[PDB]
Amino acid sequence: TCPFYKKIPGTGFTVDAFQYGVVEGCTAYFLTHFHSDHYAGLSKHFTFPVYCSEITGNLLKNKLHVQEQYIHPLPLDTECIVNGVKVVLLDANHCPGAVMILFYLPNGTVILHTGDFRADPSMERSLLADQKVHMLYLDTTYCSPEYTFPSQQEVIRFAINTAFEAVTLNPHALVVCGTYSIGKEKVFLAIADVLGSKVGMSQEKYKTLQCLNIPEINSLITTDMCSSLVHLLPMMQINFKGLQSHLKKCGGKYNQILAFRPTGWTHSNKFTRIADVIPQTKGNISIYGIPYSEHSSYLEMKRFVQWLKPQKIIPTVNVGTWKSRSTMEKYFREWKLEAGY
Ligand code: NI
Numbered sequence: 601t602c603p604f605y606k607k608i609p610g611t612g613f614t615v616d617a618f619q620y621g622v623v624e625g626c627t628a629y630f631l632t633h634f635h636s637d638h639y640a641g642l643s644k645h646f647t648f649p650v651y652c653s654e655i656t657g658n659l660l661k662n663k664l665h666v667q668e669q670y671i672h673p674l675p676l677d678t679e680c681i682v683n684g685v686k687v688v689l690l691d692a693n694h695c696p697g698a699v700m701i702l703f704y705l706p707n708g709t710v711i712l713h714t715g716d717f718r719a720d721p722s723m724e725r726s727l728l729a730d731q732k733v734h735m736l737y738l739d740t741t742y743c744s745p746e747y748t749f750p751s752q753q754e755v756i757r758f759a760i761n762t763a764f765e766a767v768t769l770n771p772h773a774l775v776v777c778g779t780y781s782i783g784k785e786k787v788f789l790a791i792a793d794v795l796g797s798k799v800g801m802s803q804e805k806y807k808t809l810q811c812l813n814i815p816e817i818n819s820l821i822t823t824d825m826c827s828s829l830v831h832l833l834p835m836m837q838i839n840f841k842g843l844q845s846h847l848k849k850c851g852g853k854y855n856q857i858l859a860f861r862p863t864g865w866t867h868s869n870k871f872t873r874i875a876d877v878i879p880q881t882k883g884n885i886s887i888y889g890i891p892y893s894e895h896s897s898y899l900e901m902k903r904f905v906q907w908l909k910p911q912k913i914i915p916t917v918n919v920g921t922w923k924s925r926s927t928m929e930k931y932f933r934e935w936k937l938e939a940g941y
Pocket residue numbers: 633635694716
């Protein structure tokens with residue numbers, strides 16, 4: 601049954617709560633973003649009202665075949681009413697169409713649900729500034745001090761300079777970028793732009809990208825593998841084996857691959873600065889592991905919560921073991937001591 605942490609007290613609302621069948625007392629289902637753990641259970645057979653961003657609504661319609669009559673898209677940074685309750689959607693700095701939701705409760709309580717987010721100081725100057733937030737439902741994916749990572753921009757700059765060099769040294773080289781769902785599109789679009797190329801990809805992935813309201817999108821992507829010097833493949837195919845195989849299917853247009861695997865965090869974040877990164881090479885194939893995260897580092901999360909000063913915190917990630925629950929509680933206590941709220 602639907603956990604307490606996916607229900608908003610005093611409303612008929614749930615968030616990201618689609619895998620329990622019909623939730624008793626829910627008059628509206630909110631969806632923060634289009635990742636499968638969050639939308640799990642939604643299909644053409646769903647017949648209740650779903651609220652979400654415009655981008656998320658395009659993906660539900662076109663990828664999950666949710667009928668249009670049940671989809672209610674809302675604009676961002678805009679005061680809206682849903683079943684008698686004032687709400688605002690804000691940009692979550694996560695994947696395309698990902699949102700945080702501010703609910704203004706009839707009793708005067710204000711609740712912020714972050715969805716999945718990567719905290720940034722620009723959120724300290726949004727509509728969140730205007731009033732006191734009482735409860736925070738927090739994306740706690742990396743809530744532990746060992747989780748450090750560079751900025752998105754540092755990683756992108758590295759990937760650009762690395763690709764430009766390789767293809768200038770060898771213009772018959774091919775750049776490949778791993779992907780598995782939406783997110784991290786900036787990695788491949790930024791590289792394709794420095795090389796002055798479109799990005800080539802499968803039909804399925806091209807369709808997904810067409811849902812994301814990217815301006816000038818038709819000038820940036822293609823299914824033509826032969827005209828194109830950046831290709832996308834699934835993350836699991838980014839190994840020497842799978843890259844050699846792919847190279848054999850471009851029709852003798854390229855003789856080399858440089859590939860990127862933008863991953864979350866792994867054990868080599870503690871030591872290696874982005875400037876120190878070197879690839880694994882086998883013959884005419886090179887693979888770079890780059891830590892491109894769409895979730896808050898420990899320090900980014902701590903700063904955000906210390907600025908916001910919520911009266912109560914409810915975690916939404918790593919909540920299934922008592923050990924994680926207990927550990928996260930200890931960090932929230934500390935954060936509250938040190939900042940005095
Ligand atoms: Ni996500």
